Design a protein around this ligand. Structure first.
Ligand SMILES: [Ca+2]
Ligand SMILES: [Ca+2]
Ligand SMILES: [Ca+2]
Ligand SMILES: [Ca+2]
Ligand SMILES: [Ca+2]
Lengths: 233, 255, 232, 233, 231
């Protein structure tokens, strides 16, 4: 089903004699999260992008500078697969039928990454309600990880990585990822979002944390630093 | 359109391909992905040998031995690929269509293999010529702009005989651009517009060096269109003769 | 003789004529040239509008990889010059027009605009055509010097976009607007010419041109499919 | 003896009522290395700084961006303590007597951090022989971690951390730390150098590596990435 | 016959030839054109030196009032092209040279430089000529496209002269006819200078001469003539 979301960091490379091909081995992200959603006409989104595009959010708390972040969005999901263990699944997606999650129902995806104002774990729920601080990137039709043949190649993919611009320094802070649409107004279909972070996972207060609910992210981000405090005394 | 088709009828030396990705597919259950690249319209391989006490084509920065290939470009080209590997012995011998220096011909199989080798280095420069009959002239004159330098960039040949010091550089236009705003100011170090270019195959280390090397040049442009396709040669006079004839052929054909 | 060739600005040959006042130069032809015959009829819908009030007709150009120069020309009227030949694009309105309608005194002051569209892959072409331009590369009003105009003031259009950086024709979709100096209603025939300095007929590498974006996409897609296949 | 070298990242803070004091808890560096050396007149250094200052090198290989690096240099060492397990000790220091390692024998310390040219593990020995690429920082009398009372407070301390300048982006690459002197020419005395890196230790090919010998650093840096390769396939 | 006219870059007429390679262009001729025939003989002193080591030969131009364009051209050799005619300047070295000496294989890689001198009044001309240049307007190596060169590589020179100062306002200009190659060179050459301005209006039309003193004498008399007419 879903192809792995890997970093752009090349570990190994070898060309295949007598062909135009070359095999590349990429360093995987320390942590990857998949998010299954469903856009139903007449159903409220998490928010709007540029005032008229339905958007759904994932929030990322980064305790310390990270080399690269990968973001991907594909629609639809039916022909690819269903959520597995550890995947995030929206209520709308659970309610949707196999037929609703497959062709011909889909939409033209769009991704936007923004830096929020929070710089401490307990400011996360607050910053989520506040306006963005800087837009880091937008991508329309960038995906090349999934061989899309059900329709035009309109799936999204963006990699934010490293006088280099500040718009790609993933330093300590809160980030919001908007999974949205190319087309303004009403749209219909399933989608799967993927987020990868190039950093060792599972080190409380040091490793990045991801969630769709800011309040929940805060709770976890706070506990994680408390754990780090405790260990350091 | 035989140039798009794959094949090196393999004999050691990995193909030098462009950075333009035609196809991509990941292998499930692994960390690997298979990429198909667009080949250069024309690729030339050049086999040389650096013998201590033997005069080079010239010097780089006054103390590095250098050997030249000259490239005449009739009209803008998307990308140029340059590669340099040392030594050659364990890879293969020159085939049909490959340039071979006199020094390389004289060298023995033993001389062309480990432990004899050197740390490669590539430099690309724009010369002054803008017309085919100015080529021999511009070759004698000083460079006009340095486009690039590469020390240890090669990733096409899996080097295991020594540290990965082989050279590889690709000069190109952003494809795709990071933004549409990119397009309004492209670093001129990258515009392979009409003109003469000199590639210096040289060394990391100053002074005397010893060993064989194979140089590769690829140009992303349809080959074999007289006066339109790029030409490559190690001798500037010869390059001029050919570049002149080619444009004459173009002139003629145009009446 | 009819319609003069549209050639690039690259000089191949040059020689002056002793004792006389003119010079003769040989120019490199474009790899591909396409001619388009149109007719602007009052009360007939254009392809679109330029600046909100100028009738416009489009040609779309898909460029797989950087190109040195593009040449665009536009002349009105056509009657006294000639009729379309084989391989020329001809609008329905032009086909319907009579010889009388296609000749003086019916004509208009031509205008050309070239714009970069958003598409960077063949299957984004139809989409980008419906979207707003991304950058304007050039405008020309009275630039033509290829056709000796003597039927009226020299108002014919000619623009060459080239390198001696927005105006570098890198991979992407371009829209050429054949339009008018004058806002509002205009009447007359016109012949457009597009030249691209690049070897023709190399599928997935050579440029493609078409007045219909959907058709252009179909062809651009097939061409890269052919290029894929050949490379494997 | 030697005080811990900690990062500048504050985990906890609390003021003491009725006083001018406040207690701060700092996040320790993921890895800290101490290096014991001895400058003997007439003995060749690792190199020279600005052509006339004796210098001794530690090399740092950084696989991926790091938030902060701490560098410290103290002289002399006698009254503080001797090397323990895991500490680097030069041959000169081993040969020196307790008397030679104590007052009145000491010198005015100086630290310089430079980015080298290597960007791959096997280029490390090479880059070490080559000229620096950028100077990141110098410090003369910055130390405030060790209460110096044997002489003027001339010990060195520098923290390199995060349009912010490139001279503090500790991205992937080789770094050379020069432990040198304020005074040009001959100097005499023991010294202890400390290096800290704000990053999780012991993750092969991801965690930073430190050594005084570039060739040895290369060997370890290479093996570490090989290990990472292997794990990723 | 031989020597092609040197015309301005001003296009009067244009017409393309249907079904062919060509478009024919009619150019505005310069108001005045002067041709200068010289010969570089090894061991013979030049007028001066360019960049200290290139032999150079001078033409001086006095311009009473702003001019649109100046054209400068230099070709080597001259033998196969033609001999000087009436109104052409001819150096003594050229007169002494034989037909053989003026033909292939004897020639050199030409080079042109144009410089503004200090004079701004006619009677300062001889003085400014001895003084250092004031500004360099242009250099050209291999610019010529007026003569179809086939005897050797196309190395003949041609130059046509927050914003710029290639402005030909009132003042003295020196044209240096020189060589690409430093040091000794051998061969004949023909230099052409065109000025886009009506000729023969004393004190208003430009004057040209290889000898600065002579140029001064004429420039002075010309303005004296203009004075007189105006009173
Ligand atoms: Ca999209
Ligand atoms: Ca190298
Ligand atoms: Ca017009
Ligand atoms: Ca100090
Ligand atoms: Ca010349």
């Amino acid at each position: 089903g879903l192809p792995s979301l890997k970093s752009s960091f090349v570990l190994s490379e070898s060309t295949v004699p007598g062909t135009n091909e070359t095999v590349k081995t990429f360093l995987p992200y320390g942590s990857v999260i998949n998010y299954y959603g469903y856009v139903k006409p007449g159903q409220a989104p998490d928010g709007l992008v540029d005032g008229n595009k339905k958007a759904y959010y994932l929030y990322v708390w980064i305790p310390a500078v990270i080399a690269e972040m990968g973001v991907r969005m594909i629609s639809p999901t039916g022909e690819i697969g269903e959520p597995g263990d550890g995947d995030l699944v929206s209520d709308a997606f659970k309610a949707a039928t196999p037929e609703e999650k497959s062709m011909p129902h889909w939409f033209d995806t769009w991704i936007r990454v923004e830096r929020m104002s929070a710089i401490m774990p307990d400011q996360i729920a607050k910053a989520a309600k506040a306006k963005p601080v800087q837009k880091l990137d937008d991508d329309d039709d960038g995906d090349d990880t999934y061989k899309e043949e059900r329709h035009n190649k309109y799936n999204s993919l963006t990699r934010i990585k490293i006088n280099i611009d500040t718009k790609k320094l993933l330093v300590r802070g809160l980030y919001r990822i908007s999974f949205t649409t190319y087309k303004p107004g009403e749209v219909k279909g399933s989608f799967v979002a993927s987020v990868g972070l190039l950093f060792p996972p599972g080190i409380p207060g040091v490793s990045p944390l991801i969630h769709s609910n800011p309040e929940e992210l805060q709770k976890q981000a706070i506990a994680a630093e408390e754990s780090l405090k405790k260990a350091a005394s």
